[model samples]
Target: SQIPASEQETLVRPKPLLLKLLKSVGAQKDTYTMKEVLFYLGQYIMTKRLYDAAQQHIVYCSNDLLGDLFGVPSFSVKEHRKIYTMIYRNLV
Candidate 1:
């Protein structure tokens, strides 16, 4: 089912921890919604593309808190590519 339009504005949808991370990165846009974030992640995984159409900014924006959110997994070199792919895929 299509997500309600209002849901796009609800920051309460994601885990509080995740929302805090997004806000910390200054991602106060509709694209930062939990549904959009996960969708971008999946598309990035499948397509291996690099571009971020959501938030009109690069995805996975750098923050010291990344390790805190993702653990020691470390995005490293793939950081831009991964987030870009996900965001672009979700947008288009």
Candidate 2:
């Protein structure tokens, strides 16, 4: 389903968290060594919602990462699918 524009605007942007993460991993000044940034992101962007939110914010606020932050670990974990499959399995 498409998110309504007005409602979607309420999606609190995650830029701050990402910026903080980048800085924490020394991405802001020295430039992120992809491995370090991914390892760092793995600590918090653990679920798909978090990963998507982070990705949206990054693309909106900054140029796409020059390196590999896009391919960070666990970034593809689908939490919604996990929950749905769990419910579906119970029904079967």
Candidate 3:
């Protein structure tokens, strides 16, 4: 994943080793920044149609990969501000 001038983000995440999730999903590289993680994460969620309109804010992580990523069944929309923060918790 030769990301040009900024495949480069300044540096790292706290749980750096946990990036295995990206590999399971098929990342070009072993190491990545939060931007990359979220990039693919959004693709996964958007393509899978995991969001529910009826629930308004609960993103469904019922799928195996998703459930494993969040370690929970769903991520609440109620915590909108912390959405990416929590998502970051999973990788960032």
**Highest-lDDT candidate:** 3
Candidate 3: where are CA atoms >4 Å away? 1-26, 77-92
> Model 1: runs farther than 4 Å from truth?
1-13, 29-63, 77-92
CA lDDT of 48 in candidate 3?
A: 74
Lowest-sum lDDT 10-residue window in model 2: 59-68
Candidate 2: tens digits of C-alpha lDDT, residues 1-92: 23234432332222444455555544444333333434454443332224355454332212334123333233223343432232223221
Query: CA lDDT, every prediction?
Result: 0.43, 0.36, 0.61
Instruction: List the candidates ranked by TM-score, beginning with the highest.
Output: 3, 1, 2
Number of the top-ranking candidate, with TM-score as the measure: 3
Candidate 3 lDDT tens digits, 28-92: 67556656766666666777778988987677987657676567788874664455556566644
Backbone clashes in model 2, listed as residue pairs: none
| Model 1 lDDT tens row, 1-92 | 24446644443334455555455544455436545665544454234333344533333423333334444323433364454343333341
Give the better candidate number (1 or 2) by lDDT.
1
Position 62, candidate 3: lDDT: 75
Q: Would you list the clashing residue pairs of candidate 1?
A: none
Candidate 2: residue 51 lDDT (0-100): 35
For every model shown, the clashing-pair count is 0, 0, 0
